[PDB]
């Protein structure tokens, strides 16, 4: 199983706009943002008290230079793909995800993926130690990188050594925020509409993301009649979700919502109490 993950998402665009910097790098530990570089701010910065408190200034200074240097490589990378795919100017996007996962048996999963203009470009897998190119145009990068030996060695080293070394430290520094359990506050709303009762089970403010929200009628889960929202983020790092069913309003009292979450000592059952 995956105990912990460190991931970086890069977004690089050819022309900035309101709320879209030329370049943004975001770090996540266990799915939670903790750091950001943004080309408008020009500095790497903490998104959590725990990285602020544990990082020293060499961390922010080095990440800052790595963000700025990335800004410049993605700018050249965009010009290169622009020429290669025979495109005209305007909004173009390079994306990257990369990171490692610490597994139950003390093993390291890690990968690096690049997207261009919303499709796969090129990807690297630790196990294979080789690049998969999406098309002939990525096959040119792959051939260059493969021919020289250097890029494979540098990414492996990072994804197998430095990336999990940093992940172990971040789990050290963030233990209190990352191990914490906040139970959902659960509330069932209902409105009658065109002669149907819509019943919604809302789960507010829970952490972590892992949750069971189901509607039951009698002894059965009424899953075929249920619609679920996403598990979606609140502004404060917690999560929100819901589950909705339609009922005959004479049957309202036959419906209840079961919720299970690691922050709740017991599963709860919720009904509409008008």
């Amino acid at each position: 199983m995956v105990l912990h993950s460190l991931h970086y998402l890069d977004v690089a665009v050819s022309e900035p706009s309101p709320g879209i910097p030329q370049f943004v790098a975001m770090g996540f530990v266990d799915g939670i943002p903790f750091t950001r570089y943004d080309s408008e701010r020009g500095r790497m910065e903490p998104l959590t008290e725990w990285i602020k408190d544990s990082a020293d200034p060499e961390y922010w200074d080095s990440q800052t230079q790595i963000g700025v240097g990335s800004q410049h490589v993605y700018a050249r990378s965009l010009e290169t793909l622009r020429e290669r795919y025979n495109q005209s100017g305007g909004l173009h996007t390079v994306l990257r995800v990369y990171g490692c996962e610490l597994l139950s048996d003390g093993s390291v999963r890690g990968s690096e993926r690049f997207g261009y203009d919303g499709r796969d470009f090129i990807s690297f897998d630790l196990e294979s130690g080789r690049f998969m190119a999406a098309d002939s145009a990525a096959e040119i990068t792959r051939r260059r990188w493969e021919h020289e030996g250097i890029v494979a060695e540098r990414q492996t080293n990072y994804l197998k050594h430095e990336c999990p070394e940093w992940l172990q430290k971040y789990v050290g520094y963030g233990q209190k925020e990352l191990e914490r359990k906040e139970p959902p506050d659960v509330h069932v709303s209902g409105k009658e509409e065109h002669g149907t009762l819509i019943l919604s089970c809302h789960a507010y403010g829970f952490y972590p993301k892992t949750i069971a929200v189901n509607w039951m009628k009698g002894d059965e889960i009424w899953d075929q009649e249920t619609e679920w929202g996403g598990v979606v983020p609140n502004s404060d790092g917690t999560f929100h979700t819901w589950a909705r069913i339609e009922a005959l309003p004479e049957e309202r009292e036959q419906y209840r919502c079961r919720v299970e979450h690691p922050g709740m000592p017991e599963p709860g059952i919720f009904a509409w109490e008008p």
Binding site: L6, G27, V73, F114, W145, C163
Partner: peptide
């Protein structure tokens, strides 16, 4: 060094 620069295309 936690983040790394991407390789050039």
């Amino acid at each position: 060094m936690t983040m790394i620069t991407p390789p050039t295309f």
